[PDB]
């Protein structure tokens, strides 16, 4: 079985830099190899076909190389628009395949650093009667990544939290983050102070409200 | 009317129709590809212009790919909760030296396999409690994906952020959409549609 192996699993590049990511086949696939770019919520887009040829409309900042078992994708002059997950794929055979695609390589693009601001949204009045309450915190337009902490009456929360990050902005590389804390109505009515803390590096910002 | 998602109870076969037309070239295959939450692309199988079908080894016996006129289907023959994934179809081509890649892709379908009933969202307003203000709507506990969210019936698009859906530990889905507006703007309304339950919900939000 032809196994497709991509390395590294994740890589970061400054805007204007150059990244090279690798694709290894376990047997000679005779350059029957394609590369794809996928952004969240979209179908994959063909970038490179026949190992080294630019697919229709693809920027010549992308370069595919290789032969036999070893292939590479190189992005030169990286742009925020390149933040994506990249996949290689063998088109040599359909038979006895576990996956035609490699495992993917995540490409994070380092734009200008931007510190977050934070917003907290107390639960609307009609939530509590459902038996659960959902508090929403938003971290606005930031780079690099942040950590979010929820505190209820000063105590850090470790369950009931879901986070959802927008993909890097194709123009400025920044993220946005939704963080939601869900409690039972009994828990919510048993506590007073609800705080969302957003930490970037060693710098924290907070928003808070009292039930 | 295509919603972009499906809810199927375990064991009931699901058939998906590729929006990309069947191969005209002889050396060409139609392919099906899944992407489970947070995971990479997993090739399911392909169909050749001589009628022959191939499946990934894990997929053997779990799917059937067929062609009818110029339309290609995927049948998930006995769905399990592990078949919850986005599904794409994609077409490729090659000659004696060049693989031309999967150049044409269909839009993903958001498939959930679950024994739970279809469920429309509960929509709750999001308001802080000063030249700008950010308001929003929490779209909580629906099944299956997707919902669509517009603001002011689609006339308000600037300053809108709609976050990716998250699947709750309950198995239901939730998301939030927010919009930044001037402090003197008249109230904004969210319009939340869930085609799988034909529910449409409006919420008017103000500071």
């Amino acid at each position: 079985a032809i196994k497709m192996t991509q390395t590294p699993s994740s890589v970061s590049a400054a805007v204007g830099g150059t990244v090279t990511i690798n694709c290894q086949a376990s047997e000679d696939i005779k350059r029957y190899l394609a590369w794809y770019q996928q952004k969240p919520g979209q179908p994959p887009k063909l970038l490179i076909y026949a190992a080294s040829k630019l697919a229709s409309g693809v920027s010549s900042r992308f370069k595919g190389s290789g032969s036999g078992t070893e292939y590479t994708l190189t992005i030169s002059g990286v742009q925020c628009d390149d933040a994506a997950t990249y996949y290689c794929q063998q088109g040599y055979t359909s038979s006895n395949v576990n996956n035609a695609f490699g495992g993917g390589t995540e490409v994070v693009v380092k734009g200008d650093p931007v510190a977050p601001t934070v917003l907290i949204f107390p639960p609307a009045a009609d939530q509590v009667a459902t038996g659960t309450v959902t508090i929403v915190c938003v971290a606005n337009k930031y780079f690099p990544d942040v950590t979010v902490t929820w505190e209820v009456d000063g105590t850090t929360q470790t369950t009931g939290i879901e986070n959802s990050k927008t993909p890097q902005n194709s123009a400025d590389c920044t993220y946005n983050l939704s963080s939601t804390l869900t409690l039972t109505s009994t828990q919510y009515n048993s506590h007073k102070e609800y705080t969302c803390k957003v930490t970037q590096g060693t710098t924290s910002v907070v928003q808070s409200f009292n039930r | 009317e295509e919603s972009g998602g499906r809810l199927v109870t375990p064991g009931t076969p699901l058939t998906l129709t590729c929006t990309v037309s069947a191969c005209s070239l002889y050396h060409c295959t139609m392919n099906w590809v899944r992407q489970a939450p947070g995971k990479g692309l997993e090739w399911i199988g392909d169909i050749y212009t001589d009628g022959n079908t191939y499946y990934a080894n894990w997929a053997k016996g779990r799917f059937t790919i067929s062609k009818t006129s110029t339309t290609v289907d995927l049948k998930i023959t006995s769905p399990t909760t592990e078949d919850t994934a986005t599904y794409f179809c994609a077409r490729d081509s090659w000659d004696a030296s060049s693989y031309y890649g999967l150049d044409l892709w269909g839009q993903g379908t958001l498939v959930t396999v679950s024994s739970g009933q279809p469920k429309g969202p509960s929509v709750f307003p999001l308001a802080p409690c000063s030249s700008t203000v950010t308001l929003g709507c929490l779209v909580k506990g629906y099944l299956p994906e997707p919902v669509t969210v517009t603001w002011n019936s689609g006339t308000l698009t600037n300053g809108v952020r709609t976050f990716p859906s998250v699947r709750q530990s309950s198995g239901l889905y939730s998301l939030s959409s927010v919009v930044s507006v001037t402090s003197s703007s008249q109230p904004v309304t969210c319009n939340v549609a869930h085609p799988a339950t034909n529910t449409k919900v409006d919420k008017t939000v103000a500071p």
Binding site: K30, Y32, Y92, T93 | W94, A96, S97, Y99
Partner: peptide, 4 residues
């Protein structure tokens, strides 16, 4: 064949 492919690669031929």
């Amino acid at each position: 064949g492919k690669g031929a």
